[PDB]
From a paper:
During the first 3 years of the pandemic, the spike (S) protein on the virus surface has been actively undergoing antigenic drift generating a large number of variants. Being a highly dynamic protein, SARS-CoV-2 S-protein has been observed to adopt RBD “up” and “down” conformations. Our structural study reveals that interactions between the VL6-57-encoded mAbs and RBD are mainly mediated by germline gene encoded residues in HCDR3 and LCDR1, while germline gene encoded LCDR3 residues support HCDR3 in antigen binding.
In binding competition assays, we found that all the 5 mAbs compete with ACE2 and with each other to bind RBD. These results suggest that all the 5 mAbs target overlapping epitopes. Among CDR loops, HCDR3 dominates the contact with RBD, the hydrophobic HCDR3 loop, containing residues L101, G102, P103 and W104, probes into a hydrophobic cavity formed by RBD residues Y369, A372, F374, F377 and P384. This hydrophobic contact is further stabilized by surrounding electrostatic and polar interactions, distributed in two different patches: the larger interaction patch is mediated by hydrogen bonds between backbone of RBD residues S375, F377 and LCDR1 residue N32 sidechain; a cation-π interaction between RBD residue K378 and LCDR1 residue Y33; a charged hydrogen bond between RBD residue T385 and LCDR2 residue E51; and finally a salt bridge between RBD residue K378 and LCDR2 residue D52.
Residue numbers in the entry:
A (entry chain A): 356 to 617, 641 to 649
B (entry chain H): 1 to 221
C (entry chain L), D (entry chain T): 1 to 110, 118 to 221
Write the structure that this text describes.
Amino acid sequence: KRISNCVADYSVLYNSASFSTFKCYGVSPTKLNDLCFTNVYADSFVIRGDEVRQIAPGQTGKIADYNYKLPDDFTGCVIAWNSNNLDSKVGGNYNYLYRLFRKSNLKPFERDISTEIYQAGSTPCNGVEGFNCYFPLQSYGFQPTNGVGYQPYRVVVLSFELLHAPATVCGPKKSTNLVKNKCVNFNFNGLTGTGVLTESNKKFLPFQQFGRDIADTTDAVRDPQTLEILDITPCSFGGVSVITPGTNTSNQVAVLYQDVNCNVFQTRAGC
Amino acid sequence: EVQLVESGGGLVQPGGSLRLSCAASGFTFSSYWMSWVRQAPGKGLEWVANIKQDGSEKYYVDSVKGRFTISRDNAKNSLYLQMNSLRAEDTAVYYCARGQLGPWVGVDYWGQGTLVTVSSASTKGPSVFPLAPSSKSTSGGTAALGCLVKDYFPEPVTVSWNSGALTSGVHTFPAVLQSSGLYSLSSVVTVPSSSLGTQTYICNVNHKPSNTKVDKKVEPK
Amino acid sequence: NFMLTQPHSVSESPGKTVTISCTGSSGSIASNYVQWYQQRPGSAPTTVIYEDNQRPSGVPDRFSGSIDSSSNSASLTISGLKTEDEADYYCQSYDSSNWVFGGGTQLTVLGQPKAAPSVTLFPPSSEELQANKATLVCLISDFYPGAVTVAWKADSSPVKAGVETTTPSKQSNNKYAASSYLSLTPEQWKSHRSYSCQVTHEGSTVEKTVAPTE
Amino acid sequence: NFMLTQPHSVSESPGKTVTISCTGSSGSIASNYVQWYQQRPGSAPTTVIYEDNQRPSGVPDRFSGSIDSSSNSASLTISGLKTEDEADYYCQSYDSSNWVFGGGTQLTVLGQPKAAPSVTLFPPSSEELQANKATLVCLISDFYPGAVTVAWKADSSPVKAGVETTTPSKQSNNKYAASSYLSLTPEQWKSHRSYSCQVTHEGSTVEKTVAPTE
Ligand SMILES: *[C@@H]1O[C@H](CO)[C@@H](O)[C@H](O)[C@H]1NC(C)=O
Ligand SMILES: *[C@@H]1O[C@H](CO)[C@@H](O)[C@H](O)[C@H]1NC(C)=O
């Protein structure tokens, strides 16, 4: 199953404790949230509690080499948990199939569906049941009162890959507290603008998120989480002008601002 | 900086009910895992309990199963631990443990803790005996002083001399276990023999479970 | 029955790389994450290992860890072995909805060979005897090593009942002190000749004699 | 504390290759030799695997064994699964001057879904009642599955005390049989009207009624 174009939510994944295995190869489990991925894949299969370590790369076994093989550069996570009452009734479950024989080893991320007759010896058996050839697919027997290592376990493997496509899956969107009437920087999904956010008196139609002016400048953006209209204004800029009494007359000067609004006198021509 | 205080201990009871509280600050209490962990004095570490960030799921070890309970709230940022039917094994120091993502990341958060000890068999009145060695030679361990505490239960006893005015040369021997399981100890201070009659010596004995404070004069024989 | 097996006293060496091994029994410890915890003796514990490969901020890079699957053991290696390393280590795992902690591995070590024992006697006074009680305490201090035996000698026969002795304790003199208590009755106190409390050490025996006459 | 962990019910299949895993906890089982022992129920045991790779003379080639050092587990494989496989297997090792045995892995299973249960009631005779003891036996057999409940009905009130029921047992008819015993006193035997034993099964209820008049 391929999962993409959605906000990743691993919070409920580690805030649950019903699972038995939370080993994340390649990438550390402590920082999934601040990582953006392109494609997310999730496999699912049921295996006995004995053959759970064989899912890890490097190990070898019947399941690890004939049914499911993982690459040595795996950068994902493996989730396993125990479900005995759901997967087995009082009589046991016999609809689950697995492989014990194959012509050779299996490459990673490769599955096989063919159910031919496995050949072990040199003399062919002409495609019928007999000696030196058997049926490589085998049914499995479950018990309700069996051992803890022989109860059914559900294993789900998560795979994360990076391609040239833009990231379609990122960690939960972070929404900081809104601060107004201060020279701050905001990024409302379309622009990295720096300025104040005053309270406007103009209503916006209920389909718009942006807004421009006569001079074609984005100066009005709607906040999405509370539906208020906030204006964008540059903080302040100007020049430092000085007045001088002259030479051989004085030594002190005064700082004059062109249009910056604030001994100190508030003149019409600035500060 | 994550700040933790634990204050729930300081008293002994056999098989009673006790309350310990851990208060936390500097983070968000409604998003990370919480746990409770104890260790015996002089022994190794062992796990006690854990609880989900909303208090929905709680688990214990099989030794304390049936008893014990834990609860939490996010309004005032505190952890609640309640115990019942205590035993003599429960003498341990309890730390409130804080998680990061789950039970696989690790504890990584250890409080200072509170010393919790239990005792039984109620209490009895301590006996004070400020021995006065009026006649003793020099070149000895103690010139002339003596105080003895016997027939007291349970530990500990705060021993003071002259209302804590003097603290130099005070040596307090550890308690000894008698044939009846009774504690006894003595404390000695090195003072000059010329101040037997010109200086007044007071041996102070305080016992917390027995709530007795006895102050006795020292008079040479 | 998941349990982790590790020693109790290792790394007793100055200034070179040593390793400590913690291994599991009931299941494979490589399935889940294992952590190492470093606690100050008599203070709050801390952590040196989380995620089985990374480090907390501020922890020096001298420590290092590794995992092998052939032995089902966890290896923690220490390189610097500076003067800061005085602690006991634990290994903690997670099997199913429960936490298991290691036993603990203490690591501590990174003028006169003979001391004369000072011995003091405190016979009961008149205050003790008027309450039908008699405490004779035999005090010993400043001995090395703390392997001593305290015995009481009567006029003609040693006693066995009524003598209690505590373990020696560490004082602030690089020595040890011990105390012995004897419970007695006044009728045999005045019916004897001389009382003695003798102590034995390595090639040494100090005996004292007192008389009931006061 | 060396102990070998293995299941108790596996290989319940008609016929194909199937493996049985036994693992150890305290130490590595690959250090010393491990063996597999087979026992038929009700007779003397034998050995299927010795020296961890070989089989005895006369033992068929179908059985085989292997060792996985990564798992610290031993695998026993049977290929043919013929009709001569009704036994429970054990894994045995050697740690130090002692022998350790496994728990045991039972292997037993290598026309009409409904069978009518037959109910038989045995009232006490004159020989029983003259000894001041009355026994009432309610016998049921030939039922499938063996999940039945046996209850006793008196003249006007069901009884609760004095009724004992055993678990069903496998007979030589591909069915199960169960027995029920009731201890009763003669005064209530003659003071009632009719005695009934009823049994409940999957959508079936059979009741047998008897009378004290003989
Ligand atoms: C945004 O979503 C929250 C719930 O997550 C809700 O309480 C709030 O009213 C929403 N704001 C809107 C729809 O403007
Ligand atoms: C300048 O700023 C002050 C306070 O920020 C304000 O009271 C004043 O009205 C401003 N002047 C102008 C011309 O906007």
